[PDB]
Design a protein around this ligand. Structure first.
Ligand SMILES: Nc1ncnc2c1ncn2[C@@H]1O[C@H](COP(=O)(O)OP(=O)(O)OP(=O)(O)O)[C@@H](O)[C@H]1O
Length: 577
């Protein structure tokens, strides 16, 4: 097979405007390709030599060094080669024009062979080898061939076709028409390597693809989540039943291991292994298993506290020269959330529970690789509780995931099996306030030993008083639920403090001291509470509906709380009906 045809492809691609003609052009090119080397063809027609995930270098040479390469291939001093480039504005064209002014033609094999060396050769003395190898190619090349060999090496193969475009064309060229798209797509999704799929399509035929499994070391197109803002709507989609994860803020890492070598692929299936040698160490030390494909989120962590840091910090890491310094300043934890392949077995077809049960049991307990924080939500309340616990930890929200026989790994597609629940609750019933704890209630029944309920109040600057707005029961982690007793008991008083007024009698009265961030749905009228007494309706005060404890405020004094006037301004701006 001769490179001539590929040069024709690129040249005509520059001329045509019809998606139809494009499909015809590629399908033709492909079918008239050589079955032996389709796996190279499929990337060259894009302007690459290999897929991104391999992690090989981008083909590149200095512009000053191309000018010498052309000058050599044409017998023309770099001086006059420089000038045509000034006037014209494309080195390929310049190269083409210099050839047509003056016995075996080029083969695709020798191009791919040569261009690999050029990409692959680095270190002392490579400059000169690149220059001489290119010159060789260009010399052997005919006019049009040259022009496009230049653009190719320059990166400037614009083109704008990608894997998807090629699959579509392979259906047309090899599957015998459009209907064959589904299968090719399916396979590619499980094995995101155009050349490998192409090779199978050609050698074993289109039918082979139907039973194709993933291959450790070649990435799976990631599964993607839908988005809804309503938690009730979400669980209805899940059959009232879901696994709910914290939505982590970090690098979406797909981790492969085969016998001993480890591979980390990015959200976009870039090879990011050499950026995370600590994750490599972590994986081999703490994840039991011969060979597998798993995925999780890599997350910047705080040296001390180990609070999570936002994604932007990992980005900063990527720009550090001393990797050992990079890791000191930007350590990392890995939160795993799925498992697609374990020891020669494809797990993509098995329920989420299954994949997770396995996933968990292979993680040796350590401080660096952990399972995503999660619960099984059996009602909306569970989902809501956890979601607010998530945003509470500065989180962006949660990933709600279906369970059962349908709950498979939908490689490369966006669908309703995973659904994100994000801060977007902003566009829903939400209003956030800072209230002062004025007292507490004991629980009820078999676990009613604890104080599990707080009387929250708002500040009234005119009267220097605190006026109750809501009784709060939910939002506390069990841990925080207990820190409460000793925290509250320490400031217990036998009678209501003179600066707090509430028509509600809690079990214990307390000193107005602690501030908590409360979130609710709307502000409603209530005979039970005193805040904004009689201002909107007589014999009743304002109240926070469906309040949820979120945080504590050590940086807020009681007088720094949300005011009664603020509660009114908030009320007064809600729709009338
Ligand atoms: N527990 C988790 N389970 C599944 N995916 C998670 C989890 N935590 C984070 N992610 C992933 O992180 C990414 C979420 O990023 P974000 O919310 O910005 O979506 P996006 O970048 O707008 O779109 P995309 O979902 O295509 O990334 C998704 O790839 C999502 O699958």
């Amino acid at each position: 097979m001769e490179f001539k045809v590929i040069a024709e492809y690129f040249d005509k691609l520059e001329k045509i405007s019809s998606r139809l003609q494009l499909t015809a052009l590629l399908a033709d090119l492909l079918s008239k390709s050589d079955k032996t080397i389709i796996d190279k063809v499929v990337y060259i027609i894009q302007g690459k030599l290999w897929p991104d995930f391999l992690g090989y270098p981008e083909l590149g040479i200095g512009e000053k060094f191309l000018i010498k390469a052309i000058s050599i291939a044409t017998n023309t001093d770099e001086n006059s080669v420089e000038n045509l480039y000034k006037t014209i504005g494309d080195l390929g064209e310049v190269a083409r024009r210099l050839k047509s002014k003056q016995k075996e033609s080029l083969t695709v094999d020798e191009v791919y062979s040569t261009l690999s060396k050029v990409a692959l050769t680095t270190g002392e003395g490579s400059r000169d080898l690149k220059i001489r190898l290119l010159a060789g190619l260009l010399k052997k090349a005919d006019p049009l061939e040259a022009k496009f060999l230049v653009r190719f090496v320059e990166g400037r193969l614009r083109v704008g076709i990608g894997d998807a475009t090629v699959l579509d064309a392979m259906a047309i060229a090899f599957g015998g028409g459009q209907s064959a798209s589904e299968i090719i797509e399916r396979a590619y999704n499980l094995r995101a390597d155009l050349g490998n799929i192409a090779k199978i399509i050609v050698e074993k035929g289109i039918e082979a693809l139907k039973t194709l499994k993933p291959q450790v070391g070649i990435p799976i197109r990631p599964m993607l989540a839908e988005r809804l803002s309503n938690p009730e709507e979400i669980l209805k989609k899940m059959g009232g039943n879901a696994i709910v994860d914290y939505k982590y803020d970090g690098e979406r890492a797909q981790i492969h291991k085969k016998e001993d070598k480890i591979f980390i692929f990015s959200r976009r299936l870039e090879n990011i292994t050499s950026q995370y040698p600590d994750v490599v160490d972590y994986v081999s030390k703490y994840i039991e298993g011969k060979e597998f494909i798993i995925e999780g989120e890599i997350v910047a962590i705080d040296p001390e506290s180990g609070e999570m840091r936002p994604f932007q910090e990992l980005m900063h890491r990527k720009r550090k020269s001393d990797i050992y310094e990079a890791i000191k300043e930007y350590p990392v934890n890995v939160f795993l959330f799925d498992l697609m392949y374990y020891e020669d077995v494809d797990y993509t077809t098995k329920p989420l529970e299954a994949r997770r049960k396995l996933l968990e049991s292979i993680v040796k307990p350590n401080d660096y690789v952990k399972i995503a924080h999660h619960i099984q939500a059996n009602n909306v309340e569970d989902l809501k509780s956890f979601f607010y616990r998530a945003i509470s930890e500065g989180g962006e929200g949660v990933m709600v995931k279906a369970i059962g026989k349908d709950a498979i790994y939908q490689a490369g597609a966006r669908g309703w099996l995973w659904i994100k629940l994000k801060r977007d609750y902003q566009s829903e019933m939400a209003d956030t306030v800072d209230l002062v704890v004025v007292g507490g209630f004991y629980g009820k029944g078999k676990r009613g030993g604890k104080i599990s309920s707080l009387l929250m109040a708002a500040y009234n600057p005119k009267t220097d008083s605190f006026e109750s707005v809501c009784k709060v029961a939910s939002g506390f982690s069990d841990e925080q639920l207990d820190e409460l007793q000793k925290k509250l008991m320490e400031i217990k008083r036998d009678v209501k403090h003179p600066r707090v007024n509430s028509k509600m009698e809690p079990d214990i009265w307390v000193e107005p001291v602690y501030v908590a961030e409360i979130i609710g749905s709307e502000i409603t009228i209530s005979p039970l509470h005193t805040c904004c007494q009689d201002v909107v309706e007589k014999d009743a005060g304002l109240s926070i509906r469906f309040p949820r404890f979120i945080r504590w405020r050590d940086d807020k004094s009681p007088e720094d709380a949300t005011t009664t006037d603020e509660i009114l301004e908030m009320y007064n701006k809600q729709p009338k009906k």
